[PDB]
Design a protein around this ligand. Structure first.
Ligand SMILES: Cc1ccnc2c1NC(=O)c1cccnc1N2C1CC1
Lengths: 412, 555
DNA sequence: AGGCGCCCGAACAGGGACTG
DNA sequence: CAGTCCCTGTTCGGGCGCCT
């Protein structure tokens, strides 16, 4: 018997009606055995045909975990509860979280099952557990408590979270604590030994305040940005000079001071691609002057809170993938490269999934926000498999791209 | 007072709306004499009531007919009430495929009678029901009433039935974990691995649990009737098949004939292996009227023939055995057509299928194969809830060469080679590096937007030039057009420099087929070469011999 | 009247390069 | 700038198949 924070769908829009996608029998078993328990505990309960709403559900194992986690795709719901969270209650984003030598991510989502949910809102949490081959119809539930992964849930539990943590923050004023959905980001410049200890210390607090918590560490101070770089060549073919000028011509959308003039004149006649052409000094000085402008920052690139983040991924071959996060073309807030992720040399989709998760993470630690991805993949390919490689409790927004390689030039 | 059978389902109205008032619409004069009485029947059974003052509600009649009836089936039209009624979460998410069912020793079918009228309507919603229909011809204006149950043709009926039924059966199933029930509409299909007689024990014992809720299960139910006929299927506990397909032999061919034709073949493809619809579907291209006259081409007839011999002998599918692995094997049928069989024990198929869909303007076999594999995986998850082990006509090196090169993320799940020609191959590869001692063709093209007139040509390191005038063309086509020239005029190894991002993009994905005859031609030359290195430079940067061929064609 | 499949066309998005 | 085109991919709407 405690209060309930009323909640409303922002004006004009309805509850999510999105269709449930087919699950593996593996995942269908894990959901049944997970939901029956959540029913017994009165977290969710069965619903009828009078409720015409659905959100998709599936299950995942977190990285290095043999236990099945239930996962709801609340993206559609979260879009329709939005004014509630952003405008109404703010979370200051620690600009320091990124500078900490270490940051651990703890799953606090369980805490959310305490609080009751506005009885009027519950009809929008409706989700179907499907059957193999359509033999039974769906088992449909709705959420009585605060559903994991909904954007209101970390919001409404805000007061309670800020409370239970206040003891710890006071004894440890230098430790930085951020919260994004089901996750709690905790970081410090402490040596890892006492860090891992201070996290357990944090584990006990929520342990004694009625929460459970199933390394997790990120190391943001070590995060590198991948700069554009022109090759180092002893001797240059026409073809080399050509690939160089073209790359430089592209890069110049980013840096206006790049010049191809003298390097261009080198190509003058119609010459064999493999013919070897010596570098004039006037060009040699132009090339060396460019390599300089490419060690600089970019005028006027800064994060604007109101605008959405956008992330682009290119497949570079042999396990490498490059990415760029930006809010406006050619102004990149970050550029990077990944290699030898799980799946390297065998499964592209696994690797891209890994990439989207690492990118989303840095994106939350940095701006406290998940990016919108442009994925170098066919819609159906991604959709058929991504659910297999998914280790995260959130779900970024994505769209599908076909961009044959002239932008492949974020890496040699 | 009436009485109270089974748990009731809350029903609202689309907020800020209320029940309908309507004028009558035509219905046949003969059958309409029967119902004047029938309403009086239901009063006594609990299915009807009335009030004079309270209903500003009226509804018309429009119905749909069914074959194979020894008596006529009534209907009422709520179309006005419907649109004004809340939406439901639909219960039918689609239907099980016969091939996904596990073999059951014993399989029975109980048919629930008065199925829709056996379910209590929501107390508070009953009101919106009032209706009127012609007496015989007519005499007096009429009378009206309200519904105490689920009306035929109401938006909410199937959904509320399905959920109540599910709700009832639930406690039985838990007490009988190893029985297996399935509900389609008002019919239930039950099956078990118990002994033939002890099974019928549970069949009545279940007819018990249903009666306890007022659900009648007659004995027209048949243990001896199976095969059961359900939605085009014939089902025996051991094996299933499509119901017999009649392929028109008609000499008269209307675009509507080919259509009905194709649809039947496509329906045949779940079971009879190797059906090809490609050439017949071509006839259908760009026709104005569905009644139009069309002749059969030799290919389309050569195809129609091969399909007929497949249907000649009958065939049957097996059922699924969770203990044994799933296997999907694909064969290339050419012309971007694909067929697959999914089996467990060799030569006994669970099901078959085609993948014919040509996706994109320019494509190749690897891509189309990758796509079929995705079609099959998706289908496999729906049906068996797992992914099959794939047997594919493609060398493990062919595939490795493709996916690791392609710019997109692409994947096939666990699969092995089956050497069953035609094998899937890459018909050419572009060099990763300039070819020493090959002629270097700088190519360009330009056309004028207004005149649709243009020229395509090239310059080489050896001094060789060419320029060809072209009529009724576009900027893109000329850039393709110049690469084409450079292929034709070059030896077995060649480097080509193009500034067309458009052109570079097509060729680099190593297409083996195209909608476009010019790209097809580029392909044919590409397959003939030993070594082709194709490079890009930015336009108008005063580059190479690119500036020169630019002058030539800009001229 | 709707569900699931196919094949086709016509509409609609959006990405670059040319018009000026 | 725009504004235009040219091209290509997706997504929707219609006709059959199987059925309510
Ligand atoms: C039409 C249908 C649809 C779905 N399942 C079944 C059936 N009927 C069967 O013929 C059937 C056959 C074999 C095994 N299960 C069957 N059953 C399941 C109920 C035992």
């Amino acid at each position: 018997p405690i209060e309930t924070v009323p909640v409303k769908l922002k004006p004009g829009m309805d509850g999510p009606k999105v269709k449930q996608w087919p699950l593996t029998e593996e995942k269908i078993k894990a959901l049944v055995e997970i939901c029956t328990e959540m029913e017994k505990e009165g977290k969710i309960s069965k619903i009828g045909p009078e409720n015409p709403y659905n959100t998709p559900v599936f299950a995942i194992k977190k990285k290095d975990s043999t236990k099945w986690r239930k996962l709801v795709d609340f993206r559609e719901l979260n879009k329709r509860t939005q004014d509630f969270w952003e405008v109404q209650l703010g979370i200051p984003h620690p600009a320091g979280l990124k500078k900490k030598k270490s940051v651990t991510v703890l799953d606090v989502g369980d805490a959310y099952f305490s609080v009751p949910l506005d009885e009027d809102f519950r009809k929008y949490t409706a989700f179907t557990i499907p059957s193999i081959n359509n033999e039974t119809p769906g088992i449909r539930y709705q959420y009585n408590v605060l559903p994991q992964g909904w954007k209101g849930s970390p919001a409404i539990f805000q007061s309670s979270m800020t409370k239970i943590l206040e003891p710890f923050k006071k004894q440890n004023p230098d430790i930085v604590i951020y919260q994004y959905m089901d996750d709690l980001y905790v970081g410090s410049d402490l040596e890892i030994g006492q860090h891992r200890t201070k996290i357990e210390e944090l584990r006990q607090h929520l342990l004694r305040w009625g929460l459970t918590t199933p390394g997790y560490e990120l190391h943001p101070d070590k995060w590198t940005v991948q700069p554009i770089v022109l090759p180092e060549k002893d001797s240059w073919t026409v073809n080399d000079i050509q690939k160089l000028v073209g790359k430089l011509n592209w890069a110049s959308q980013i840096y206006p001071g790049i010049k191809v003039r003298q390097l261009s004149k080198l190509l003058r006649g119609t010459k064999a691609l493999t013919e070897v052409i010596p570098l004039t000094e006037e060009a040699e000085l132009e090339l060396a002057e460019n390599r300089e402008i490419l060690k600089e920052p970019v005028h006027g690139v800064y994060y604007d809170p109101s605008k959405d983040l956008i992330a682009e991924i290119q497949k570079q071959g042999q396990g490498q993938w490059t990415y760029q996060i930006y809010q406006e073309p050619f102004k990149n807030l970050k550029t990077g490269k990944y290699a030898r992720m799980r799946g390297a040399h065998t499964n592209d989709v696994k690797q891209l999934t890994e990439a989207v998760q690492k990118i989303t993470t840095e994106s939350i630690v940095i701006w406290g926000k998940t990016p919108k991805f442009k994925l170098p993949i066919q819609k159906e390919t991604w959709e058929t498999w991504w659910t297999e490689y998914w280790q995260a409790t959130w779900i970024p927004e994505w769209e599908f791209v076909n961009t044959p390689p002239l932008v492949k030039l974020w890496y040699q | 007072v009436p009485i109270s059978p089974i748990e009731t389902v809350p029903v609202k109205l689309k907020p800020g709306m209320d029940g309908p008032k309507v004028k009558q619409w035509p219905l046949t004069e003969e059958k309409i004499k029967a119902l004047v009485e029938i309403c009086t029947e239901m009063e006594k059974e609990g299915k009807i009531s009335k009030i004079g003052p309270e209903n500003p509600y009226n509804t018309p009649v429009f119905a749909i007919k069914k074959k194979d009836s020894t008596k006529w089936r009534k209907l009422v039209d709520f179309r006005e009430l419907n649109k004004r009624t809340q939406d439901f979460w639909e219960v039918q998410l689609g239907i099980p495929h016969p091939a996904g069912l596990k073999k059951k020793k014993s399989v029975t079918v109980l048919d629930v009678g008065d199925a829709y009228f056996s379910v209590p309507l929501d107390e508070d919603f009953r009101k919106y029901t009032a209706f009127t229909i012609p007496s015989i011809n007519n005499e007096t204006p009429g009378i009206r009433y309200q519904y105490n149950v689920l009306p035929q043709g109401w938006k909410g009926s199937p959904a509320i039935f399905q959920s109540s039924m599910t709700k009832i059966l639930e406690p039985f199933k838990k007490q009988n974990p190893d029985i297996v029930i399935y509900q389609y509409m008002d019919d239930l299909y039950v099956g078990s691995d118990l002994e033939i007689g002890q099974h019928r024990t549970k069949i009545e014992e279940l007819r018990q649990h249903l009666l306890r809720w007022g659900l009648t299960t007659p004995d027209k139910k048949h243990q001896k009737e199976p095969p059961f006929l359900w939605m085009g299927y014939e089902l025996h506990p051991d094996k299933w098949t499509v119901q017999p397909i009649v392929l028109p032999e008609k000499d008269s061919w209307t675009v509507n004939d080919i259509c009905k034709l194709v649809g039947k073949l496509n329906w045949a493809s779940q079971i009879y292996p190797g059906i090809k619809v490609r050439q017949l579907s071509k006839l259908l291209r760009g026709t104005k009227a569905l009644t139009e006259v069309i002749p059969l081409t030799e290919e389309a007839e050569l195809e129609l023939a091969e399909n007929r011999e497949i249907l000649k002998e009958p065939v049957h599918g097996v059922y699924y055995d969770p203990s044994k692995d799933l296997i999907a094997e694909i064969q290339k049928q050419g012309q971007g057509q694909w067929t697959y069989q999914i089996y467990q024990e060799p030569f006994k198929n669970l099901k078959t299928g085609k993948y014919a869909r040509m996706r994109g303007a320019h494509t190749n076999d690897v891509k189309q194969l990758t796509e079929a594999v995705q079609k099959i995986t998706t289908e496999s998850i729906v049906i068996w809830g797992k992914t099959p082990k794939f047997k594919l006509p493609i060398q493990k090196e062919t595939w490795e060469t493709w996916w690791t090169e392609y710019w997109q993320a692409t994947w096939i799940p666990e699969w092995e080679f089956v050497n069953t020609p035609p094998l899937v191959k890459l018909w050419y590869q572009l060099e990763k590096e300039p070819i020493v001692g090959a002629e270097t063709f700088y190519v360009d093209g330009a056309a004028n937007r207004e005149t649709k007139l243009g020229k395509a040509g090239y310059v080489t390191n050896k001094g060789r030039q060419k320029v060809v005038p072209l009529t009724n063309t576009t900027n893109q086509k000329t850039e393709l057009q110049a690469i084409y020239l450079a292929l034709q005029d070059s030896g077995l190894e060649v480097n080509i420099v193009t500034n067309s991002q458009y052109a570079l993009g097509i060729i680099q994905a190593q297409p083996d087929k195209s909608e476009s005859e010019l790209v097809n031609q580029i392909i044919e030359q590409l397959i003939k070469k030993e070594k082709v290195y194709l490079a890009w430079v930015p336009a108008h940067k005063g580059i190479g011999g690119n500036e020169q061929v630019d002058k030539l064609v800009s001229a």
